[PDB]
Amino acid sequence: ETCENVDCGPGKKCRMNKKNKPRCVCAPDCSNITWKGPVCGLDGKTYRNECALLKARCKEQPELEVQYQGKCK
């Protein structure tokens, strides 16, 4: 009924959504990442930072990875 004793696993934390249900949501620890500027993803899209890529990875693209640092071409 709450986020109590819920273990969402890695890269995920527990949060009550608007309907009052506990949900594990993607929430990568950005303080763990050392490169802070933008990155270019394997989908060819630039992501604002690496943390943002990791969230897209957890949420919608399991194979997404950083292909190079900086903006994509």
Swiss-Prot record:
Task: Mention one GO molecular function.
Answer: heparan sulfate proteoglycan binding
Write down the superkingdom of origin. Answer: Eukaryota
Q: Name one GO cellular component term.
A: nucleus
- Tell me where it mainly resides: secreted
Q: Where in the cell is it found?
A: Secreted; Nucleus, Nucleolus
Q: Which GO biological process categories is it annotated with? A: ameloblast differentiation; BMP signaling pathway; cell differentiation; cellular response to growth factor stimulus; female gonad development; gamete generation; hair follicle morphogenesis; hematopoietic progenitor cell differentiation
Identify the glycosylated residues. Answer: 32
Instruction: Please state every residue range assigned to the domain named Kazal-like.
Output: 20-73
- Listed disulfide bonds for this chain? 3-14, 8-24, 26-58, 30-51, 40-72
Q: What are the UniProt keywords, alphabetically?
A: Disulfide bond, Glycoprotein, Nucleus, Repeat, Secreted, Signal
Location of the Follistatin-like domain: 2-25
Functional note: Multifunctional regulatory protein whose primary function is to antagonize members of the transforming growth factor beta (TGF-beta) superfamily including activin, myostatin, GDF11 or bone morphogenetic proteins (BMPs). Mechanistically, binds to these ligands in the extracellular space, blocking their type II receptor-binding site to inhibit downstream signaling. Plays an essential role in muscle fiber formation and growth both by preventing the repressive effects of myostatin and through SMAD3/AKT/mTOR signaling independently of myostatin.
Subunit-level organization: Interacts with GDF11. Interacts with activin A/INHBA. Interacts with myostatin/MSTN.
In Swiss-Prot or TrEMBL terms, this protein is called Follistatin
Organism annotation: Rattus norvegicus (Rat)
Counting on the full-length protein, the chain here runs from 93 to 165 of 344
